[PDB]
Amino acid sequence: AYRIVSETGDKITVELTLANKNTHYVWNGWCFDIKNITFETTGKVLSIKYADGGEPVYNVNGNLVTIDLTWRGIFHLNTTVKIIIEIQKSGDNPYPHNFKIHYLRGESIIYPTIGELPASWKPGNFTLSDLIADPKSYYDPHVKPHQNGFIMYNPPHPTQIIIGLADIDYPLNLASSARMWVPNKYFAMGLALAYEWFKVNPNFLMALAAKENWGTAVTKDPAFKGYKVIIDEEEYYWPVQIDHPDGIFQVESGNFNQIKAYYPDIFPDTADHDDYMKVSLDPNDTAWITSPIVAAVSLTMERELLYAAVGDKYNEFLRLAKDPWAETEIIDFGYNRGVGAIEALKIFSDNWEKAINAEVLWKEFNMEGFGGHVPTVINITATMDMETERIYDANLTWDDIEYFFTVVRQKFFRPGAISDEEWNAMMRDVKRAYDLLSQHWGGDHISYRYDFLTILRVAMKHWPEPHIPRPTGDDWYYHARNYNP
Amino acid sequence: AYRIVSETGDKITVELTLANKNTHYVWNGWCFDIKNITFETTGKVLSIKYADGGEPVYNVNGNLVTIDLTWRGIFHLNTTVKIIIEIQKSGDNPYPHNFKIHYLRGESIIYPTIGELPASWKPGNFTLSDLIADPKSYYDPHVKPHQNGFIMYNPPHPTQIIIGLADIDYPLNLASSARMWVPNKYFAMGLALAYEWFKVNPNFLMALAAKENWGTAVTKDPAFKGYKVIIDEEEYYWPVQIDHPDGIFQVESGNFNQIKAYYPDIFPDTADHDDYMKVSLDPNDTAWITSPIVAAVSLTMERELLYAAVGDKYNEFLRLAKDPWAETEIIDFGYNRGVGAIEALKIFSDNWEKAINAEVLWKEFNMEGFGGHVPTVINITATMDMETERIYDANLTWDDIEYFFTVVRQKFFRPGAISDEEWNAMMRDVKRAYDLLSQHWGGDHISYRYDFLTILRVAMKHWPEPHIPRPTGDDWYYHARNYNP
Numbered sequence: 030a031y032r033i034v035s036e037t038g039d040k041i042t043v044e045l046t047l048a049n050k051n052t053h054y055v056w057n058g059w060c061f062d063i064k065n066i067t068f069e070t071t072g073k074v075l076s077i078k079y080a081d082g083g084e085p086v087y088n089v090n091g092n093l094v095t096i097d098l099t100w101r102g103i104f105h106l107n108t109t110v111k112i113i114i115e116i117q118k119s120g121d122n123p124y125p126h127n128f129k130i131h132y133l134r135g136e137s138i139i140y141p142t143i144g145e146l147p148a149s150w151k152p153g154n155f156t157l158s159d160l161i162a163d164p165k166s167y168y169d170p171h172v173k174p175h176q177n178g179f180i181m182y183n184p185p186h187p188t189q190i191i192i193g194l195a196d197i198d199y200p201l202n203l204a205s206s207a208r209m210w211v212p213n214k215y216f217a218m219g220l221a222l223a224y225e226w227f228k229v230n231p232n233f234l235m236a237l238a239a240k241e242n243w244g245t246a247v248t249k250d251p252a253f254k255g256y257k258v259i260i261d262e263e264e265y266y267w268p269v270q271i272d273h274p275d276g277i278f279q280v281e282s283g284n285f286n287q288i289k290a291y292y293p294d295i296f297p298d299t300a301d302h303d304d305y306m307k308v309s310l311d312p313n314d315t316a317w318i319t320s321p322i323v324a325a326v327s328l329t330m331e332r333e334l335l336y337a338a339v340g341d342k343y344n345e346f347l348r349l350a351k352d353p354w355a356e357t358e359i360i361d362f363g364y365n366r367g368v369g370a371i372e373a374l375k376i377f378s379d380n381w382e383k384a385i386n387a388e389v390l391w392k393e394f395n396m397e398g399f400g401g402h403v404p405t406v407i408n409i410t411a412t413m414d415m416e417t418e419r420i421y422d423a424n425l426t427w428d429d430i431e432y433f434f435t436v437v438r439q440k441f442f443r444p445g446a447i448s449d450e451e452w453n454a455m456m457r458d459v460k461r462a463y464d465l466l467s468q469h470w471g472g473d474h475i476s477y478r479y480d481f482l483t484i485l486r487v488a489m490k491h492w493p494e495p496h497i498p499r500p501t502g503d504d505w506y507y508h509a510r511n512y513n514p
Numbered sequence: 515a516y517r518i519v520s521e522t523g524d525k526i527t528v529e530l531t532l533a534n535k536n537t538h539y540v541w542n543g544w545c546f547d548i549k550n551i552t553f554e555t556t557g558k559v560l561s562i563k564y565a566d567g568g569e570p571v572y573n574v575n576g577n578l579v580t581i582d583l584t585w586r587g588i589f590h591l592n593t594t595v596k597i598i599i600e601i602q603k604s605g606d607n608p609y610p611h612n613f614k615i616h617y618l619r620g621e622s623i624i625y626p627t628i629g630e631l632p633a634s635w636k637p638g639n640f641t642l643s644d645l646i647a648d649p650k651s652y653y654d655p656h657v658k659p660h661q662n663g664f665i666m667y668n669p670p671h672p673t674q675i676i677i678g679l680a681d682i683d684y685p686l687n688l689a690s691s692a693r694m695w696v697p698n699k700y701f702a703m704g705l706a707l708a709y710e711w712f713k714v715n716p717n718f719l720m721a722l723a724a725k726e727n728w729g730t731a732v733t734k735d736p737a738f739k740g741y742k743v744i745i746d747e748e749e750y751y752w753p754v755q756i757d758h759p760d761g762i763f764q765v766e767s768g769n770f771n772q773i774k775a776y777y778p779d780i781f782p783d784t785a786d787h788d789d790y791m792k793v794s795l796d797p798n799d800t801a802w803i804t805s806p807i808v809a810a811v812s813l814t815m816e817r818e819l820l821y822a823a824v825g826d827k828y829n830e831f832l833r834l835a836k837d838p839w840a841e842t843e844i845i846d847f848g849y850n851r852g853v854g855a856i857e858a859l860k861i862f863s864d865n866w867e868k869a870i871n872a873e874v875l876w877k878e879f880n881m882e883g884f885g886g887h888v889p890t891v892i893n894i895t896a897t898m899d900m901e902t903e904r905i906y907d908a909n910l911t912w913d914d915i916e917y918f919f920t921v922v923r924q925k926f927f928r929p930g931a932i933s934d935e936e937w938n939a940m941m942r943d944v945k946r947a948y949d950l951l952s953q954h955w956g957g958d959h960i961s962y963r964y965d966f967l968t969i970l971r972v973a974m975k976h977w978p979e980p981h982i983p984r985p986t987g988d989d990w991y992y993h994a995r996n997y998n999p
């Protein structure tokens with residue numbers, strides 16, 4: 030909020046008040062991290078100072094003034110900052126106007142729409158038609174191959190989840206061959222939520238787990254001792270280290286600690302690394318659900334950090350790069366070698382031309398990662414994307430769905446984001462949607478492939494908006510302001 | 515505190531109050547993380563409940579009662595928890611007694627004493643003999659070789675710093691040979707503070723930086739382009755990536771975030787990864803001082819975590835293991851592959867006997883790390899330890915000392931740990947010690963090798979006690995309680 034304090038002589042004095050007025054947690058408003066504040070004037074800036082002493086930094090570019098709050102840019106609950114701006118009147122638009130708070134978060138970040146519930150849908154007594162816009166398309170088994178990498182910009186179907194269980198000819202982790210597989214349906218539901226929530230391609234998370242710890246692939250390579258898995262009367266080895274505390278995505282505790290700090294809206298303060306990541310042979314281990322969501326948030330963090338640092342240049346890079354897998358390569362490299370290692374490449378500054386002209390970015394920039402990480406993950410994602418013959422599907426029962434959302438409620442969001450009443454109303458709608466969708470299959474289950482995205486969308490109609498919160502807080506602030514990739 | 519509320523019949527009722535009574539930050543009292551509370555009674559425990567509802571977990575083992583606060587074990591500023599204990603009177607010592615709060619922190623952790631100032635030393639007008647207990651040994655140039663790895667259990671000298679600038683025949687990062695080199699004296703002083711504060715061997719940090727990013731070694735090997743470095747009559751390549759955001763120790767932002775969270779007593783909230791780690795060819799870059807201290811704290815965190823999880827078994831392991839470099843191999847492996855990777859080894863539980871009987875631990879357990887990390891670091895550390903002929907030394911001026919402490923003041927501790935007047939009193943003592951110690955050299959400087967540890971001890975007389983704070987806070991709590999190595 031802002032106010033003319035006085036206009037006296039040719040001197041215009043304005044007070045700007047910046048605050049987080051929240052006194053208790055609310056969704057997306059627990060902390061605001063301010064990159065800068067802009068405003069316009071044709072007058073001459075005489076001084077910009079804090080009301081309670083000291084002054085921010087500012088610069089003028091034509092009619093555009095940019096205030097940098099430097100050490101004072103972080104706004105926790107109940108925090109107010111008052112700024113006094115003095116202008117010498119001149120020109121045709123001298124009063125400070127068009128104030129914009131710019132958060133430390135790329136304003137142009139692209140989060141694609143995968144699909145949407147029919148516009149006629151409303152909570153409570155919706156009907157089957159309120160769920161399924163176009164039945165012929167909804168149940169169509171024909172698979173359209175695609176080439177999405179990390180982010181699903183061009184989903185092959187708006188309501189179907191297509192995990193391609195392709196045979197892999199690439200030498201995965203030095204095995205002669207592999208086959209992708211989904212260890213259980215609770216894991217599959219976690220992938221689906223990562224997809225619908227953060228727009229991450231399930232095939233990319235599948236590929237990533239396979240490289241990191243064989244989480245999602247088996248092999249006939251007899252060099253590769255592992256658990257025995259029989260799949261339609263053929264013996265495979267599953268070379269996963271299933272009790273590894275970092276899980277099938279190999280997320281370490283330092284990275285977990287950091288994304289917890291960045292995402293108070295996603296992680297409660299109780300969230301613990303081994304509890305969220307460490308799976309086991311038991312399909313009921315809750316980490317089968319939480320760990321693909323954690324991996325998706327970790328990947329999301331890299332993308333969000335890049336956007337926060339380079340703004341509009343990020344989409345310009347996506348438009349211009351000659352390597353169509355460039356973004357996916359950068360994000361996978363950063364996952365394995367860290368965002369410091371991305372930053373050192375200087376793709377978005379010093380080495381821009383070389384980067385956008387590279388036919389294979391990772392070869393030009395030596396961004397393999399350890400153990401052929403980048404080419405492996407990219408090759409497997411591409412192979413899965415092309416798969417049409419063998420697509421994952423599973424029967425989900427009401428108990429499965431109920432269990433899934435209980436775990437989500439236990440492990441994600443913070444108290445105050447969704448009330449008990451809201452959660453209960455959400456679960457009535459989810460159960461009703463399950464009941465209507467089950468009828469197509471004989472009433473005893475719904476389909477993971479055909480129905481589960483619609484179930485998620487019904488649930489998410491009740492989630493706080495916007496569904497993807499900003500990364501925020503003190504650590505994010507200093508890290509993203511000092512990041513120059 | 516605790517109190518007998520009533521003794522009535524054979525029923526004794528006790529109220530136990532656990533609190534963090536601090537209302538503002540105080541050294542080592544910002545948060546208390548309680549693993550459990552023990553007390554003794556010959557009586558029979560009837561109940562243990564919280565005064566405001568619900569109850570903790572407790573177990574009885576003979577006369578020893580162990581209360582586990584589970585979700586309530588974290589005590590931030592101004593937090594109180596009240597527990598009601600009911601005992602059925604019996605035996606000769608029925609009243610709850612010998613109450614002990616056990617922090618989530620190994621009580622038997624070993625931090626060796628390198629040396630101490632003479633007992634006569636006091637602030638103000640201290641004298642030379644108040645600084646130097648034994649002139650003949652203090653200035654003795656004879657070098658005693660040693661074999662300390664990560665922690666300096668058996669320092670080769672109590673007042674001299676001995677960094678051995680050994681020639682290296684081990685194929686460091688695939689080079690045919692190398693030479694250890696301290697890039698500048700500000701880095702040397704940061705190593706010295708890591709040594710005196712956290713008992714970390716300077717040769718181990720030298721070895722670590724060399725393996726991570728050539729930070730502390732140069733080479734004649736032509737295959738390895740790098741900055742041209744001339745030492746005396748000899749020219750070398752310095753293959754360091756000097757602008758890497760993760761610095762010469764390759765500390766990533768997630769690990770940095772985590773140690774900030776664990777160590778509020780060491781890092782202010784403003785501490786920024788790239789600012790603390792990223793060095794440059796300029797010797798006045800402040801990251802030459804901060805980054806070895808950050809690396810030391812990161813290694814310290816691993817050891818503190820292992821002690822917190824396994825208690826007395828840690829020292830037992832040190833005592834029994836057949837490999838005299840076992841602890842160093844474990845800490846270095848954890849540095850490169852993470853504490854999750856240490857935990858997966860089960861050295862301290864499932865694979866205990868195999869671990870204490872290994873002649874070479876890392877070979878037995880396949881804990882090489884990437885790129886031969888563990889054998890490289892251990893070999894260089896050992897080689898440096900053995901060096902007697904070429905030992906680092908440098909002239910330090912008063913400007914040098916003032917600058918060093920100015921950076922320490924800006925980058926470490928948080929407000930409330932050391933007042934401005936405490937700091938100014940400290941710098942007077944440091945100045946006086948500098949002047950006293952400079953006499954030996956003709957008055958123009960002191961010696962890094964011979965004098966700087968004494969300078970640090972003079973400053974540290976004014977630092978909060980105990981000088982090593984406990985790791986603490988929410989993330990530490992969940993992580994260390996769930997850690998099972």
Ligand SMILES: CC(=O)N[C@@H]1[C@@H](O)[C@H](O[C@@H]2O[C@H](CO)[C@@H](O)[C@H](O)[C@H]2NC(C)=O)[C@@H](CO)O[C@@H]1O
Nearest residue numbers: 201202203240241242243270273279399400402
């Ligand atoms: C040359 C090769 O492909 N080696 C494989 C390893 O890369 C796999 O280990 C995993 O490697 C990634 C980096 O590529 C690490 O991030 C990850 O932590 C690591 N996984 C584990 C459990 O250590 C390994 C998987 O079994 O298989 C090959 O050795």
Ligand SMILES: CC(=O)N[C@@H]1[C@@H](O)[C@H](O[C@@H]2O[C@H](CO)[C@@H](O)[C@H](O)[C@H]2NC(C)=O)[C@@H](CO)O[C@@H]1O
Nearest residue numbers: 686687688725726727728755758764884885887
């Ligand atoms: C086979 C070998 O020795 N390769 C060297 C690499 O190990 C060095 O890179 C560094 O490797 C460690 C793991 O061993 C990484 O933690 C570290 O981040 C990485 N350093 C950099 C700057 O990426 C490399 C140093 O230039 O030299 C050889 O390639």
